[PDB]
Specification:
The structure is a homodimer of 40-residue chains. With 40 residues, chain A is mostly helical. Chain A is built from one helix and no strands. Chain A has a single domain, classed as cAMP-dependent Protein Kinase, Chain A. Chains A, B: This is Receptor tyrosine-protein kinase erbB-3.
């Protein structure tokens, strides 16, 4: 192992980030969306 | 013999995880705790 372990490690890091970002942007967006029935 | 970049990398991974977990457990917990609508 040396440079190949970067593939797995990279996926883990990216996975978490995408979750925190997606979840945050999704939750906040969803909440606001339902908040107002009219168009933005 | 050789482990330095693991420190920084470890922090990043742990940081994200803690966020996804804390945020999720906090948000869900908060919502359930005070399900009552907001007044502000």
């Amino acid at each position: 192992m040396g440079r190949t372990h970067l593939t797995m490690a990279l996926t883990v890091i990216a996975g978490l980030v995408v979750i925190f970002m997606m979840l945050g942007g999704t939750f906040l967006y969803w909440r606001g969306r339902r908040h107002h029935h009219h168009h933005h």
